[PDB]
Structures are given as structure tokens and as C-alpha cells.
Amino acid sequence: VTLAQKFNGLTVLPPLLTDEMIAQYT
Amino acid sequence: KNKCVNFNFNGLTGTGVLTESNKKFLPFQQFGRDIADTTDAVRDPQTLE
Ligand SMILES: *[C@@H]1O[C@H](CO)[C@@H](O[C@@H]2O[C@H](CO)[C@@H](O)[C@H](O)[C@H]2NC(C)=O)[C@H](O)[C@H]1NC(C)=O
Numbered sequence: 001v002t003l004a005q006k007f008n009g010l011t012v013l014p015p016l017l018t019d020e021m022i023a024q025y026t
Numbered sequence: 027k028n029k030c031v032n033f034n035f036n037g038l039t040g041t042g043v044l045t046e047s048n049k050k051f052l053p054f055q056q057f058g059r060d061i062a063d064t065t066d067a068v069r070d071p072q073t074l075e
Contacts, residue, residue: 004060004061004062004064004066005062007042007064008064
């Protein structure tokens with residue numbers, strides 16, 4: 001799976017659990 | 027440079043942190059845009075960079 005907006009007031013927030021914490025639960 | 031400013035270049039009013047670019051325009055271009063059709067580079071009209 002492969003993943004200019006910002007200065008229009010739009011922003012992307014991080015998830016609470018990092019990919020390391022999802023891997024530790026798994 | 028490296029400072030937030032109110033710029034005008036050739037009538038292009040905008041705001042931003044100016045930085046020395048690594049991009050390389052062909053001689054007839056003066057301006058540059060991102061995927062969103064939004065400005066992301068400009069060429070200095072007096073000291074061509
Ligand atoms: C506009 O004129 C200035 C000179 O007033 C040009 O800048 C000069 O460029 C030469 C060549 O690089 C240098 O030897 C001079 O020392 C520069 N002087 C100054 C004051 O910048 C500038 O390049 C010109 N701009 C355009 C678009 O022609």
C-alpha cells in the first residue's frame with residue numbers, strides 16, 4: 001500500500017497508536 | 027530568505043517562506059506549480075534564480 005493541501009487550511013492528524021504499537025498488539 | 031513574508035513577484039501576491047531552489051526551469055518559464063495547480067516556485071526577475 002503506497003501513501004500542496006496544507007496552505008489551504010487543511011491538515012492530517014496522526015493516529016493515537018503508532019504502527020509500532022499496532023505491531024506490539026498484533 | 028528563510029523568513030515568512032508578504033511577497034509580490036511580477037503581480038503574484040502571496041505569503042510564504044522563500045528558499046533557494048534546487049529546481050531547474052527551462053529559460054522561458056518564470057513561475058512554478060504543484061499538483062493542486064497551486065504556486066510552489068518563482069523565478070527572481072532581477073538576479074535569475
Ligand atoms: C538587473 O540589473 C542588475 C544590476 O543593477 C543585475 O545584477 C548584476 O548582474 C551582473 C552579472 O551577474 C553582476 O556582475 C552585477 O554585480 C549585478 N549587480 C547587481 C546590483 O545586482 C541584474 O542581473 C539585472 N537583472 C536582470 C533580470 O537583467
